[PDB]
Amino acid sequence: PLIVPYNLPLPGGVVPRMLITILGTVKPNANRIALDFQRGNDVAFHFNPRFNENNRRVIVCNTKLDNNWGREERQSVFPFESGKPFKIQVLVEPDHFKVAVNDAHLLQYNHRVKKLNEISKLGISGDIDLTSASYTMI
């Protein structure tokens, strides 16, 4: 029952072995979800489930630098379902963010923004009820 959009500070930025866990439930008739790992105004890693992009469900990932989006990375494996509870786990690895949903590996996103310790907030937004958002070291 957290407020959405939700800002989760990541003190000191991210680092390999940091695991971020998001628990929520997708709203009925959802259109989109977004996770935005931010370096100031830049978005180091945008993870964007789209429930209806031309009648397809797709996850779009990208980076925003100086207000410009970069090259999209797309994943048609789509583990979210309207109305249903989910778990997103984002593990920071040396070279990439590694994302699993409901305990199944989904995608990796190579670090474009390389100052990991400056990626010090995570925004969580979209068509969800947000239950919890937290981090730990593994």
Ligand X SMILES: CNc1c(F)c(F)c(-c2cn([C@H]3[C@@H](O)[C@@H](CO)O[C@@H](Sc4ccc(C)cc4)[C@@H]3O)nn2)c(F)c1F
Q: Is 39 annotated as a binding residue?
A: no
62 has which bridge partners? 46
Contact residues for ligand X, defined by CB under 6 A:
32-34, 46, 48, 60, 62, 69, 72, 125-126
Q: Is 118 annotated as a binding residue?
A: no
Q: Is 93 annotated as a binding residue?
A: no
C-alpha closest to that of 35 among 56, 55, 14? 14
CB closer to ligand X, 31 vs 117: 31
Q: Is 108 annotated as a binding residue?
A: no
Determine contact, residues 75/106, Cβ cutoff 8 Å. Answer: yes
Q: How far is the CB of 103 from ligand X (least distance, A)?
A: 24
CB closer to ligand X, 60 vs 107: 60
Torsion angle (degrees, nearest 10) of CA 8, 103, 59, 61: 50
Tracing tokens 């409901």 back to the chain, one arrives at: 102
CB closer to ligand X, 18 vs 59: 59
Residue type, 38: Q
Binding site listing for a beta-D-galactoside: 69-75
Residues comprising the binding site?
69-75
